[PDB]
Amino acid sequence: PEVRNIVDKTASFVARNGPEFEARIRQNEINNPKFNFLNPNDPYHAYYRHKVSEFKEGKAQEPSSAFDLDVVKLTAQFVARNGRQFLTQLMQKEQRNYQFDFLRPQHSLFNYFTKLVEQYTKILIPPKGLFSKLKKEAENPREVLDQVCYRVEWAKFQERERKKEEEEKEKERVAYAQIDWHDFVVV
Amino acid sequence: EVKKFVKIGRPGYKVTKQLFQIDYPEIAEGIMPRHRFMSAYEQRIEPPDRRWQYLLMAAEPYETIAFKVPFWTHWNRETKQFF
Amino acid sequence: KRVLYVGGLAEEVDDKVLHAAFIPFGDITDIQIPLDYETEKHRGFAFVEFELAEDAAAAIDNMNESELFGRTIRVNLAK
Amino acid sequence: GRVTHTRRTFDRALRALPITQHSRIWPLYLRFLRSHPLPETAVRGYRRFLKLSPESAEEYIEYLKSSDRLDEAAQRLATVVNDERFVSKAGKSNYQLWHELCDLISQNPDKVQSLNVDAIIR
């Protein structure tokens, strides 16, 4: 397509450089019917003129229990000695003729099992007390002030985030009380 | 005001059922297009025998994809696809 | 929320059919379909109760806008 | 080695009508179809006109398409293609597109008479 490709070229030029580039082309090639579509003289004028904004905005395409607590603590201590998700100190004891329904994942006591496990991991990691000593906590007002301000700062970030969530929910409420219930249609 | 400036362009819905996934133009608004099950009794003419519910998912620039039914969604603004 | 509410119980739609076609997404523990006692036909509403929320969510998502013997059925989340 | 055990065993396993005995009755026809298509066609026809299921004709035609008797497979397919009470027997599952696939494998470069092929396309 000669005339179509030329109109799309003028449209890309208008998108990149403006209609002032169109006027420049008009004064530079008013001697040729190639700037005729950049002029009111050829029929491609309005098509390429709207095509300018089309290619500028991206609509066209460019041309081509104490005991229970102790037992849960013992389970966490045994799961700190677990080597894999299957081979640990709880697997056989689950079916070893003693009552243990706390390994089940739906019973709320599995949350206490998992929290005991998380504390067991944070205490059995290398800095948890295994083979080294951390002293920026045991003698450190500088680290204490740092970490305390940091907890307060995470608290402030979470406060701003909850406020943002509440504002968004308010916008959602005002828009749910404002969705259209007359011009409904099925496609 | 959210409706005092409620523009009615009435654009078509492009939604695929079979769980529904609808596409719409670039809005540039954080409001998520919401769905809901509503009654089949309201209308400006209302031909008789309206006895089913209608699930309509509508937003700002794209008209409401509604369908009679005889955080359970997702809104991708980087692709503009709603599920 | 491990419940699938199956709207659209067709003429011969029984709990066996419902839990059989929606059983593959997860272990469905119970099924109950409202059958009109004066009509012997279901009310277009059944309830499949699984133990898995992932199962029932995937079932509601993939079993919606469904079809069983020429009937446009829809699976939703029970309240 | 004798059809006596086959018949009597099938009948005794069929005393109840659960999903039991099904894949012993029909694979019996499968293993009987060897060197004798008559009992295969017998079990196929009597089954398609026997105990109710939409999977009945499914297993029948899917067992018959694998043998040297295929117009019987198409006959069970036609039982499905009428079906007398369920135009859609299986929901999203396909019988007619599969029949079209078998018609395509028949109009495959064997019957190049150029009449059966265009007939199968129509």
Across the strands, what pairs with B14? B23
- The residues after which chain B has a C–N gap greater than 2.5 Å are 18, 70
Nearest-Cα residue of chain C relative to residue D88: C69
Contact present, D82 and D76 (Cβ < 8 Å): no
Contacts of C68 (CB under 8 A, 6+ apart): C8, C10, C13, C17, C21, D91
Q: Give the distance, in angstroms, between the CA of residue B76 and the centroid of all CA atoms in the same chain.
A: 15
With residue A176 as reference, give the H or E element that holds it.
helix A141-176
Helix D54-64 to helix D37-48 angle (10° resolution) is 160
Nearest-Cα residue of chain D relative to residue C73: D91
DSSP letter for each residue of chain D? --HHHHHHHHHHHTSS-SSTTHHHHHHHHHHHTSS-HHHHHHHHHHHHTSS--HHHHHHHHHHHTTSS--HHHHHHHHHHHH-SS-SSSSTT--SHHHHHHHHHHHTTTT--SSSHHHHHH-
Length of chain D: 122
Contact present, A173 and B51 (Cβ < 8 Å): no
Chain A neighbors of B10, CB-CB under 8 A: 183
Alpha carbons A122 and D16: distance in angstroms, whole number:
62
D to A contact (≥3 Cβ pairs closer than 8 Å)? no
Contact present, B34 and B57 (Cβ < 8 Å): yes
Contact present, B60 and B31 (Cβ < 8 Å): yes
With residue A156 as reference, give the H or E element that holds it.
helix A141-176
The SS3 call for residue B2 is coil
The SS3 call for residue C51 is coil
Q: What single-letter DSSP state applies at residue A126?
A: G
Q: Give the distance, in angstroms, between the CA of residue A54 and the centroid of all CA atoms in the same chain.
A: 31
Integer distance in angstroms from the first to the last C-alpha of chain C?
A: 8
CA quadruple A50, A56, A57, A58: dihedral, nearest 10? 100
Cβ count near A60 (within 10 Å)? 17
C72 at interface of B, judged by CB pairs closer than 8 A: yes
Q: What is the CA radius of gyration of chain D?
A: 16
Reading the block at residue B11, the tokens are 């654009």
Contact across the interface for D87 and C70, Cβ inside 8 Å: yes
| Long-range contacts, stretch B22-28, CB < 8 angstroms, 24+ apart | B22/B57, B22/B62, B22/B65, B22/B81, B22/B82, B23/B62, B23/B80, B23/B81, B23/B82, B24/B59, B24/B61, B24/B62, B24/B80, B24/B82, B25/B61, B25/B62, B25/B80, B26/B61, B26/B80, B27/B59, B27/B60, B27/B61, B27/B62, B27/B80
Alpha carbons A148 and D24: distance in angstroms, whole number:
74
Amino acid of residue D46: Y
Contact present, A181 and B43 (Cβ < 8 Å): no
Alpha carbons A105 and A18: distance in angstroms, whole number:
65
Contact present, A35 and A42 (Cβ < 8 Å): no
Alpha carbons B17 and B13: distance in angstroms, whole number:
12
Contact present, C27 and C67 (Cβ < 8 Å): no
Nearest-Cα residue of chain D relative to residue C63: D92
Contact across the interface for B19 and C61, Cβ inside 8 Å: yes
Contact present, D56 and D47 (Cβ < 8 Å): yes
Q: What single-letter DSSP state applies at residue A60?
A: S
Alpha carbons A180 and B62: distance in angstroms, whole number:
12
Contact present, A10 and A21 (Cβ < 8 Å): no
Helix D96-106 to helix D71-82 angle (10° resolution) is 150
The H helix count followed by the E strand count for chain C is 2, 5
The SS3 call for residue A172 is helix
Reading the block at residue A29, the tokens are 């090639």
**How is domain C1-79 classified at the CATH fold level?**
Alpha-Beta Plaits (3.30.70)
The experimental resolution of this structure, in angstroms, equals: 3.0
The SS3 call for residue C16 is helix
Give the technique used to solve this structure. Answer: cryo-EM
CA atoms within 13 A on the CB side of B26: 6
Cβ count near A47 (within 10 Å)? 17
Of C5, C25, C74, which to mutate for an interface test with B (greatest number of B Cβ within 10 Å)?
C74
Q: Give the distance, in angstroms, between the CA of residue A16 and the centroid of all CA atoms in the same chain.
A: 33
The SS3 call for residue A50 is helix
With residue C25 as reference, give the H or E element that holds it.
none
Order of all β-strands in the sheet with B14-17: B14-17, B20-23, B81-82, B75-76
Alpha carbons B11 and D82: distance in angstroms, whole number:
43
The SS3 call for residue A42 is coil
Cβ count near D12 (within 10 Å)? 9
Contact across the interface for C69 and D92, Cβ inside 8 Å: no
Residue in this structure with the two tokens 């018949």, named with its chain if needed:
D7
Alpha carbons C4 and C75: distance in angstroms, whole number:
6
Residue spans per domain, chain C: 1-79
Across the strands, what pairs with B38? B54
Nearest-Cα residue of chain C relative to residue B70: C8
Contact across the interface for C65 and B72, Cβ inside 8 Å: no
CA distance B41 to chain A (A): 10
Cα–Cα distances in angstroms (integers) from residue B65 to residues A94, B74, B80, in the given order: 52, 15, 14
Alpha carbons A89 and A83: distance in angstroms, whole number:
9
**Among residues C56, C69, C72, which one has the least CA distance to residue C19?**
C56
Please report the residues numbered 11 through 40 in chain C whose beta carbons come closer than 8 angstroms to any beta carbon of chain B.
none
B38 at interface of C, judged by CB pairs closer than 8 A: no
Cα–Cα distances in angstroms (integers) from residue A76 to residues A66, A68, A81, A106, in the given order: 15, 12, 9, 17
